[PDB]
Design an enzyme around this catalytic site. Sequence first.
Site, short mmCIF file in Angstrom:
data_model
loop_
_atom_site.label_atom_id
_atom_site.label_comp_id
_atom_site.label_asym_id
_atom_site.label_seq_id
_atom_site.Cartn_x
_atom_site.Cartn_y
_atom_site.Cartn_z
N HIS A 170 -3.20 10.87 0.12
CA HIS A 170 -2.73 10.70 1.50
C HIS A 170 -2.10 12.01 1.94
O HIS A 170 -0.91 12.03 2.33
CB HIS A 170 -1.72 9.55 1.58
CG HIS A 170 -1.56 8.95 2.95
ND1 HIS A 170 -1.66 7.59 3.18
CD2 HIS A 170 -1.25 9.50 4.16
CE1 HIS A 170 -1.45 7.34 4.46
NE2 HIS A 170 -1.19 8.48 5.08
N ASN A 178 -7.90 1.71 9.64
CA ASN A 178 -6.64 1.85 10.36
C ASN A 178 -6.94 1.73 11.85
O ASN A 178 -7.99 2.15 12.31
CB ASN A 178 -5.97 3.19 10.04
CG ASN A 178 -5.65 3.37 8.54
OD1 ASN A 178 -5.69 2.42 7.73
ND2 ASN A 178 -5.27 4.59 8.19
N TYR A 195 -4.74 1.82 15.84
CA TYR A 195 -3.51 1.97 16.61
C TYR A 195 -3.72 1.89 18.11
O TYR A 195 -2.88 1.31 18.82
CB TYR A 195 -2.79 3.30 16.30
CG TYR A 195 -2.22 3.36 14.90
CD1 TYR A 195 -3.00 3.71 13.82
CD2 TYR A 195 -0.89 3.02 14.66
CE1 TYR A 195 -2.48 3.74 12.52
CE2 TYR A 195 -0.36 3.06 13.39
CZ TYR A 195 -1.16 3.41 12.33
OH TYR A 195 -0.62 3.43 11.08
N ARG A 202 0.85 -1.18 0.00
CA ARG A 202 0.00 0.00 0.00
C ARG A 202 0.89 1.24 0.00
O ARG A 202 1.67 1.45 0.93
CB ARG A 202 -0.96 0.04 1.21
CG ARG A 202 -1.77 1.34 1.29
CD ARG A 202 -2.90 1.32 2.37
NE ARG A 202 -3.58 2.63 2.46
CZ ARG A 202 -3.57 3.46 3.49
NH1 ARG A 202 -2.92 3.17 4.63
NH2 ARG A 202 -4.21 4.64 3.38
N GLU A 262 -3.83 -0.16 7.99
CA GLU A 262 -2.74 0.28 8.83
C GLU A 262 -2.93 -0.24 10.26
O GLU A 262 -4.04 -0.22 10.78
CB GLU A 262 -2.67 1.81 8.91
CG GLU A 262 -2.10 2.53 7.71
CD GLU A 262 -2.12 4.04 7.89
OE1 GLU A 262 -1.90 4.51 9.03
OE2 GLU A 262 -2.35 4.74 6.90
N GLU A 310 -7.86 8.56 5.75
CA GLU A 310 -8.26 9.25 7.00
C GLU A 310 -8.84 10.66 6.80
O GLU A 310 -8.28 11.64 7.31
CB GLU A 310 -7.13 9.27 8.02
CG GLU A 310 -6.58 7.89 8.34
CD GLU A 310 -5.51 7.92 9.42
OE1 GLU A 310 -5.05 9.02 9.79
OE2 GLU A 310 -5.14 6.83 9.90
O1 GI3 Z 1 -5.11 6.99 12.85
C1 GI3 Z 1 -3.87 7.18 13.24
O2 GI3 Z 1 -3.58 7.25 14.42
C2 GI3 Z 1 -2.83 7.26 12.21
C3 GI3 Z 1 -1.52 6.85 12.33
N1 GI3 Z 1 -0.93 7.07 11.15
C4 GI3 Z 1 -1.82 7.61 10.31
N2 GI3 Z 1 -2.99 7.73 10.96
C5 GI3 Z 1 -1.58 8.00 8.89
O3 GI3 Z 1 -2.42 7.18 8.05
C6 GI3 Z 1 -0.09 7.82 8.58
O4 GI3 Z 1 0.21 8.70 7.50
C7 GI3 Z 1 0.77 7.99 9.88
O5 GI3 Z 1 2.19 8.16 9.75
C8 GI3 Z 1 0.47 6.81 10.80
C9 GI3 Z 1 1.31 6.77 12.06
O6 GI3 Z 1 1.04 7.89 12.91
#
Ligand code: GI3
Length: 435
Positions: free
Chosen positions: A119, A286, A288, A75, A341, A164
């Site tokens: 992006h 995504n 985290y 990706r 992600e 996002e």
């Molecule tokens: O939703 C999130 O917390 C998020 C984390 N991240 C992102 N979004 C973005 O999609 C990436 O471009 C970032 O580098 C990556 C890491 O921080």
Amino acid sequence: VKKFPEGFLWGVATASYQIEGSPLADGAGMSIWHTFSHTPGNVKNGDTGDVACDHYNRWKEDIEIIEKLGVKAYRFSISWPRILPEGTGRVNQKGLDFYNRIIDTLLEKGITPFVTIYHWDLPFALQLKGGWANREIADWFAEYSRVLFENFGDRVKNWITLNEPWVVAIVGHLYGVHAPGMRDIYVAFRAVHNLLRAHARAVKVFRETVKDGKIGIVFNNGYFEPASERAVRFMHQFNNYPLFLNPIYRGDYPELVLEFAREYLPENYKDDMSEIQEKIDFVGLNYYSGHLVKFDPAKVSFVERDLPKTAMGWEIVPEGIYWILKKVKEEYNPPEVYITENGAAFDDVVSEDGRVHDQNRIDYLKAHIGQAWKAIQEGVPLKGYFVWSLLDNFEWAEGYSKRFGIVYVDYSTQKRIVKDSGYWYSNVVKNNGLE
Ligand SMILES: O=C(O)c1c[n+]2c([nH]1)[C@H](O)[C@@H](O)[C@H](O)[C@H]2CO
């Protein structure tokens, strides 16, 4: 053993501004991340994307690394201003050449490309015309998309309109922490609405241009839990996929979003909702982190919990990824889902043995891959999972100080060092699951 379905997509994920460097090489227009990061005070340590991972010259090496790891999907995003330097009108053949070489190389090595159209690196030329605040962005995005489909749609068959859009609108236009660095709630919600309209116009052009591919859209998601025993319902509807998927699937914004923000949305926004429902082929999630949430007179605040945190200070909450997978099936039942992600920043050190012993990242990844497996058992149509990131890269307003890669990048030499995470992940991919 936790084994995944046959033909499950194991991938890694990057973004153009985060890894490429050379933002003005070969006739590329400036982007808003160029102008934003070159503005003092906006990014940690004055860091910019001028060099980054130098992937703009090192692309073959990085792909060879993907191949060598046996990772099956890549990706990556395309920089809009490389392709159309002024955002609309002129097309830059050298920008197309750059991604054409990446695309063909991946196909030769049997890696499946997943292309994120947007992006976050909007052409600066379009920001001067209002960027996401301007209704005309639906047309500008549609024309950009059309260019990509025409040039690459013979080979790329998996497409993501937006990465996002909540972050783009809210962090870019209300918090002002990301480009274009604005702090206006009314602009921010007009950006939400326009991101939807532009996404839908791009899907519509896709159906006319690439008749054998698939297109979706990617959302950031948190796993929110309540402090006492509604503000959680809000955070889900606002910070998670419902903000966009309720329009896409149900033709309006979620209920608690309309309560908070009706006044900030355009007056006749419902006029656009029928076009916004353009059918999509998959949802990218995504994931985290988890957050403990309390009501607090947006009438919400975070409560810090003990819990292991990453270098971002994000609470490690693996069950959130199973939750968010179950909840998307339950709420919108999309035909396909990907985890586009998932990853973690840790303070990575190259040991004297020459390796990066990131057992913390391995523990993080393994915990979340287990939870995604569970949701597949309970019927979530998860077709793929993508580690953020292949490389340590420019982490937006954090600069180079946050390392998310499964491959370490030594910035003074550009040397790549596969981390214990990468080797570990390579083995997961080979085995098609956990052992
Ligand atoms: O939703 C999130 O917390 C998020 C984390 N991240 C992102 N979004 C973005 O999609 C990436 O471009 C970032 O580098 C990556 C890491 O921080």
